[PDB]
Amino acid sequence: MDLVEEILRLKEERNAIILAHNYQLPEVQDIADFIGDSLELARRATRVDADVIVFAGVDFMAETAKILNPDKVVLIPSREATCAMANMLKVEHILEAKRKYPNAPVVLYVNSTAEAKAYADVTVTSANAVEVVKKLDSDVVIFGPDKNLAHYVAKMTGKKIIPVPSKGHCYVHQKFTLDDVERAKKLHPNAKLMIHPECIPEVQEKADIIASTGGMIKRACEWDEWVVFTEREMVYRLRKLYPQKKFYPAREDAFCIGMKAITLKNIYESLKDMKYKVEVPEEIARKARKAIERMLEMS
Numbered sequence: 001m002d003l004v005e006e007i008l009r010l011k012e013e014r015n016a017i018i019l020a021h022n023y024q025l026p027e028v029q030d031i032a033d034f035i036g037d038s039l040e041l042a043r044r045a046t047r048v049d050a051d052v053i054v055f056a057g058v059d060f061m062a063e064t065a066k067i068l069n070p071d072k073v074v075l076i077p078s079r080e081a082t083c084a085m086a087n088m089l090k091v092e093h094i095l096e097a098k099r100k101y102p103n104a105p106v107v108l109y110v111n112s113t114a115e116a117k118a119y120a121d122v123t124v125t126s127a128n129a130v131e132v133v134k135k136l137d138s139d140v141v142i143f144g145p146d147k148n149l150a151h152y153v154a155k156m157t158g159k160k161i162i163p164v165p166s167k168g169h170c171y172v173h174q175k176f177t178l179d180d181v182e183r184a185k186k187l188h189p190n191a192k193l194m195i196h197p198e199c200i201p202e203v204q205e206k207a208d209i210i211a212s213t214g215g216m217i218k219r220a221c222e223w224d225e226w227v228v229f230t231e232r233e234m235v236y237r238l239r240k241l242y243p244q245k246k247f248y249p250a251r252e253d254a255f256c257i258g259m260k261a262i263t264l265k266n267i268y269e270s271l272k273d274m275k276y277k278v279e280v281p282e283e284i285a286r287k288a289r290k291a292i293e294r295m296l297e298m299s
């Protein structure tokens, strides 16, 4: 494909940087200027000197980048790139919890809607949720939208966690079952199990290490053979970072359809047409920024 070389000429003449999440297609990872989890992506978005950000991720991640860079152009290659977990949390869920627990801080995953983040005291990802919640003064915390991460946070902080909404979860990581753990140990007897904290608690209890995708990268040096309980394209990421090690997905069907809405072709069309421009209403942007900034400073 001359498509790769044409993306690179376009981004260079646009003064653009391509930021990509770890779950992006291999073709997208191979052209990205930076690849990381959502916390690393949020951090990288605070030191962008480029004029344009092309965000190879889901729409609410791109909105976070826009909240952190209101002066810059942020493009999402497809407006259908979205997070099913984040869409489960409505503002009314938060207000109801705030009425019932008036002194609980509101702690939302950074991928939530900008409207929901406007009601957060602080945001988190899987990478920093325990560290942030531990620092909060209150013993009661409103937390969402992922109930499986909420379970993990309650276990690691000892605090009372009120999940909002009740059914919030990521369907990709919810796919994993104890049956998949048992099958992994038979297929790969010498491997260790990396499990993401968005998996269900009984699956997490089987892990050798429980870690966000950034944590999986930091801890892969502890063993040479891993079975990976997270989204399929993280296995590609690990294999390219560590060619000398062995990695295997726990389920080949554990893939995020929203992440896969971004392709090499619509990144090219994104740079060619300067679309689609990400905008956040000023009122909502300002309130969400305060919680995202608190997250960065508390991490």
Ligand SMILES: O=C(O)c1cccnc1C(=O)O
Binding pocket: 021, 036, 037, 038, 039, 058, 083, 111, 125, 126, 127, 170, 196, 198, 213
């Ligand atoms: O990078 C993360 O925090 C993350 C971790 C697990 C599942 N999804 C995400 C995401 O950003 O959409």
Ligand code: SF4
Binding pocket: 023, 058, 082, 083, 084, 085, 086, 170, 171, 172, 173, 231, 256, 257, 258, 259
């Ligand atoms: S992986 Fe799960 S959480 Fe991350 S974007 Fe896809 S649906 Fe949302």
Ligand SMILES: [Cl-]
Binding pocket: 037, 038, 126, 127, 211, 212, 213, 214
């Ligand atoms: Cl992660």
Ligand code: NA
Binding pocket: 022, 036, 037, 038, 212, 213, 214
């Ligand atoms: Na991640």
Ligand code: NA
Binding pocket: 037, 038, 039, 040, 125, 126, 127, 128, 212, 213, 214
């Ligand atoms: Na993260």
